[PDB]
Structure 1
């Protein structure tokens, strides 16, 4: 059916994929451990905000 005409070079190619681009993952610290806690979450230790229940064996 309908196919392009070339590819306005790397130029465009990127232009687009460009405004696309990556980003990062948001982190703070274990209110109990230390490390990277993303809002509501536990992790392989402190597993808590009061009463772990998680991490061990």
Structure 2
């Protein structure tokens, strides 16, 4: 409001191009060891999906 301020309205072409880097990257996902579903790597696969580790059960 005070000291600086924009001098001209930015074109639709110019905000849209600023946003050319705003796209998301879809999650990284692997199929679980033995349980059915898809899970993110290096994590406790939400349907119990660990052997030598615990799992907090879905069971």
TM-score for the superposition, normalised by structure 2: 0.68
Are the structure 2 counterparts of residues 39 and 49 from structure 1 closer, same or farther at C-alpha, using a change threshold of 3 Å?
farther
- Structure showing the higher helix proportion among its residues: 1
The CA RMSD over aligned residues, in Å, is 2.1
The total of aligned residue pairs comes to 57
Q: Give 5+ residue unaligned stretches, structure 2.
A: none
Q: Give 5+ residue unaligned stretches, structure 1.
A: none
TM-score for the superposition, normalised by structure 1: 0.70
